[PDB]
UniProtKB/Swiss-Prot annotation:
It catalyses: heme b + 3 reduced [NADPH--hemoprotein reductase] + 3 O2 = biliverdin IXalpha + CO + Fe(2+) + 3 oxidized [NADPH--hemoprotein reductase] + 3 H2O + H(+). The chain holds residues 31 to 239 of 316 of the full protein. GO terms for biological process: heme catabolic process; heme oxidation; response to hypoxia; response to oxidative stress. Belongs to the heme oxygenase family. It is an enzyme of class 1 (oxidoreductase). It is found in: Microsome membrane; Endoplasmic reticulum membrane. Keywords: Acetylation, Endoplasmic reticulum, Heme, Iron, Membrane, Metal-binding, Microsome, Oxidoreductase, Phosphoprotein, Repeat, S-nitrosylation, Transmembrane, Transmembrane helix. It is a single-pass type IV membrane protein. This is Heme oxygenase 2. It comes from Homo sapiens. Residues 1-209 are cytoplasmic. A soluble form arises by proteolytic removal of the membrane anchor. One of its GO terms (molecular function) is heme oxygenase (decyclizing) activity. The record marks 130 as: Important for catalytic activity. Inhibited by metalloporphyrins such as Sn- and Zn-protoporphyrins.
Length: 209
C-alpha cells in the first residue's frame, strides 16, 4: 500500500496522544505565557536546525532527494528571526537545548548519518503538520502573546514560498509514495514516524513542567 496511507493509519494513535498533551491543550486555549513559548521555540530551533542539516547532507541520496525542498520548507532561517525577536541579537548565548529536544536532535543526526532512508519519517511528520497547522497556530500565539501585527515571533508558522499548502502537501505526498521502497523499509519508516511522535510528546511534557 501507499506509504502515505501506512503512515496515516500506523501513526494515528501516537499522533492523538501527542495532540492530547497538556501543553497542546493549554496552548490552543491561549494559556501559554511568553517565557514558556520562548522555551518551546528554542526546542524548535534546535530540532529544525538538526533536521535541515541532515536533509542537506542527504539532498542527493535516492531515498530522500525528491523531498529536498530548502526554498519551500526549511524553517531554520524563520526560527532564527523568531529567536532574535524573542531574545535579541545575542540569543544564541541565552539558550540551551532542552533535554528531550537534545535526545530528538541526536536521533535525527543518527538517522541522517546511518539510515538515510528513514529521514522521510521525520521530514514528513514535521513539515506536513507544519503546513496544515501554521495559520491556526500563528493566530493563537499572536493573540495570546500580543505579538506585533507585522509577524515578529511567528515566522516559523508562515511558509513564505508555498503559494498553496494543499497543492504542495499533495505534491509532497505523491513524491513520497513514489520512492522505490519495499514493504520492509516502509514499515520501518512508519515505526520511525511513531518514534518521532514520541519525542514530540516528551518535548511537550518537558515544557509542561
Ligand atoms: C502543535 C502545537 C504546539 C506548537 C508549540 C511548539 C512546541 C513544539 C514541540 C515539538 C517539537 C518537535 C517534536 C517532533 O519532531 O515531533
Amino acid at each position: 500500500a501507499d506509504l502515505s496511507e501506512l503512515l496515516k493509519e500506523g501513526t494515528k494513535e501516537a499522533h492523538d496522544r501527542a495532540e492530547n498533551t497538556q501543553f497542546v491543550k493549554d496552548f490552543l486555549k491561549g494559556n501559554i505565557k511568553k517565557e514558556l513559548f520562548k522555551l518551546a521555540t528554542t526546542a524548535l530551533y534546535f530540532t529544525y536546525s538538526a533536521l535541515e542539516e541532515e536533509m542537506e547532507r542527504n539532498k542527493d541520496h535516492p531515498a530522500f532527494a525528491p523531498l529536498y525542498f530548502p526554498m519551500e520548507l526549511h524553517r531554520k532561517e524563520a526560527l532564527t528571526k523568531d529567536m532574535e525577536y524573542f531574545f535579541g541579537e545575542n540569543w544564541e548565548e541565552q539558550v540551551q537545548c532542552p533535554k528531550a529536544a537534545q535526545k530528538y536532535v541526536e536521533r535525527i543526526h543518527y538517522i541522517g548519518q546511518n539510515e538515510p532512508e528513514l529521514l522521510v519519517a521525520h521530514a514528513y511528520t514535521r513539515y506536513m503538520g507544519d503546513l496544515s497547522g501554521g495559520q491556526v497556530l500563528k493566530k493563537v500565539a499572536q493573540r495570546a502573546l500580543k505579538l506585533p501585527s507585522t509577524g515578529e515571533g511567528t515566522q516559523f508558522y508562515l511558509f513564505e514560498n508555498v503559494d498553496n499548502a494543499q497543492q504542495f502537501k499533495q505534491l509532497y505526498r505523491a513524491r513520497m509514495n513514489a520512492l522505490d521502497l519495499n514493504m520492509k523499509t516502509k514499515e520501518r519508516i512508519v515505526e520511525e514516524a511513531n518514534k518521532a511522535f514520541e519525542y514530540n510528546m516528551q518535548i511537550f511534557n518537558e515544557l509542561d513542567q
